[PDB]
Amino acid sequence: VNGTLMQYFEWYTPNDGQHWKRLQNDAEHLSDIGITAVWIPPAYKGLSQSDNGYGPYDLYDLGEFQQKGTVRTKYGTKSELQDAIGSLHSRNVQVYGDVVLNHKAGADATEDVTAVEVNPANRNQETSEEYQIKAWTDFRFPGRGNTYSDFKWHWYHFDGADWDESRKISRIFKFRGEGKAWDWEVSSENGNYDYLMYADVDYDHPDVVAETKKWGIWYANELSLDGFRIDAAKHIKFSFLRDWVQAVRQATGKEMFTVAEYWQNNAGKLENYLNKTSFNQSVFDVPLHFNLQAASSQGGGYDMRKLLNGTVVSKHPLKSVTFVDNHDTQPGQSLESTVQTWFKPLAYAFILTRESGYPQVFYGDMYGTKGDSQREIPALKHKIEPILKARKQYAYGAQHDYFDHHDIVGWTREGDSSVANSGLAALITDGPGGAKRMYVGRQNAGETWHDITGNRSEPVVINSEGWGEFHVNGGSVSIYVQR
Template sequence: MKNGVMMQYFEWNLPDDGSLWKQLKEDAQHLHDIGVTAVWIPPAYKGCGTEDVGYGTYDLYDLGEFDQKGAVRTKYGTKQELIEMIEALHACDICVYLDAVMNHKAGADHIETCMARLVDPDDRDQPLCEPYEIECWTGFDFPGRGEKYSDFKWHWFHFSGTDYNERDKKTGIYQIVSEGKAWSVGVDNENGNYDYLMFSDIDLDHPDVIADLKHWGIWVTKETKIDGMRLDAIKHMNDKFTKQFLEAVRAECGAGFYAVGEYWIEDIETMEGYLANVEYGIDLFDVCLHYNMHKASKNSCDYDLRTILDNTLVSRHPELAVTFVDNHDSQQGSSLESYIEDWFKPSAYALILLMEKGYPCIFYGDYYGTEGNVSPHKDIIEKLLDVRQRCAHGIQTDYFDHPCTIGFTRQGVEKIPGSGLALLISNGEDGEKQMNVGIQHAGEVWHEITGNRTEEVTIDNEGNGLFFVSGGKAAVWTP
């Protein structure tokens, strides 16, 4: 009855030294020991240069094997180091999920000429001019790789938009104009149509593009033996393509191939609509819960903790929800900055790691730190991971009955001695709450494991205990 935990093993500011794959290989046993069961790794293929985090994708087939964009290695290492790292994780019973960026390409090899028109960034369906000829960076020949693994070469007609006209040195959103070409449907309707995000936008309606991306998905899965993918920027991608892509990979690589998508939106109805469109074939990160926790951390005791799970994916579709506190996009200095304040972060992690529902994901920056700084949360995360494995089992009973103090209990299961827990979270003053942990725990003495409280709680004959929490803290009580 192992409780799965994912770790995002990177942050935005890692050094450009090619060391991450080696570091992760050496860290595999440690991750297993603390209870991590899967690792989400950054894009492992060649970007615009070695400094690229991976989202400026140049060549999906170059995993650090070819001399392209100034080096053989990627920011994180070579292909051989990638393979060895995955083998080490698998030897420790840890799954590996690759970050897959299929929305756009960057760092083209040569300029091409095509017809395009500028569109309104706030409404991409509104042209700002008539189509005219531009010079765009859309030619991808991959001279360092040649035709190894794939002979597909990219040209302007494989894209739906780009961001720069070399002829007049102007930036903007240029919609490429050609017979039968249009922005994709099945994308988010923000800005009219949110097909275009950045760089040269891949046309996911083009049959040759679809065929090569499916080929890549199957190839990279077999080549590296990854267990799943994190799909980047899916709100900007034709949902029909995403569904077909995963079906193709699972048909060749096994129905258990895991996928979680990044649909960054704070609207549960939009998320539910997307899941229906892809026939519930993918998990999603619970961005709605992230923003609830962000607001809780910003508003302190003015936030009603009873609402923290309202309109979240984990409350509507718990089997499809990947819960997280922060990630590389929400961390300080990122484009979607919305990080959870340090005072509330232990409570946020206690919530996602100890509750019955959801697939929790830990952020590298919260565990190891960002920009070379040590994280203040490593110790509490390790304690919570330990409690998750030993104690976070059995029926959950919620006590979301006070605006500043909420909690829940897990009754534990007979086959795991010592299991069961009580969690209290406060965003105001010290609090207490009587909660039931099950009559099977009658007579037991429970202690608080974070160090915030020193009392002992004796469970009465009906399974009740009076549990305590310090103001602005989380308290985790276990047998």
């Protein structure tokens, strides 16, 4: 069976403490539509109750300790999350946990630290003489005590921070101490992009590295996770991320599928990350996201023959996680670059019915986003489900590509003898509709095939040679399968 990942959250999921219950109630439905793995949001306590999880305070508080004025996280309590994972698991759906290791936010108090300012466009350059600041680096975990881990954090466990409480100014401060320096290797944008926001963890510190490995093993075992999504990978020492993943696999004996968020629209740089991590993890195909978005926004003028150009999936198909949109690219967000609604079903056809890549479905696209703009994503589940059924039941066997026209492009899947009635013919167009003759296999000769999306009502008959003439409406998608 073809695997399909589901991102189970959007930026504006409500702070009602019921997200784990929602997941538990949706488990049967997700298993019935073909989802094989769910990516859940950061499950540990944030700087406040309403933080989405990307400003993590305590990685060992999964919503059971009274800290930051709340027991539960935004999403719910620990026992509610364990019950949700339990329902997914009894329906053979895997669970991937979001892992936020770059920084820590919401310290309990400030400490005095000697620091220097650096050039925001070249963090290897120091731009001030050293002086004293009051930084938020003291993490004590008053509501947890020593439960699970007695480690406490201090300034010397971080490389730098962005706020001096003394002067009430925001700069990029690098701390002075024993062997203090920005980690390497990281992205070389801005000279060295180790530093991002909040208090930046120092992955040169031996105790920090050992503790974070231990935490990783604990987390996987405490929730029985099947894999991980690594946040902000380009800002974290690459060799450390390689070793951390390996240590968790060594201790659990599990495969621990892992996908890293390496946010850069450049295949060469993504390839550098795969090599530096010994190919032990996949990456999200950022470039493909931008190609799809570009196509959706040029009103038919995009050359559809170029959709694969510069993508990770054309070079390292087995290590790519393909996606249409996510919580960062949705409207109003930091990396906003939404795939226009009219093209969204065409983009889902492209990632769900092609043989390469591991495709992700966005929660926001299935159910609608609840942000406050006038351009929110509408609920598209009634248009996506038919394509997911095409992936689950027909997308098997040899593939043939027809990237031969600036608007109308298609592909076919011959089917596999072990999946009864499998096989399909897909066509998409960023402009006027039309036709294309394509080969689906001589073993399907004589069959009556129909558009499972319902966009076209006229069936097509496969000729005695295994070729059919397929049609597609303007700015639309058609996916033909056995009637």
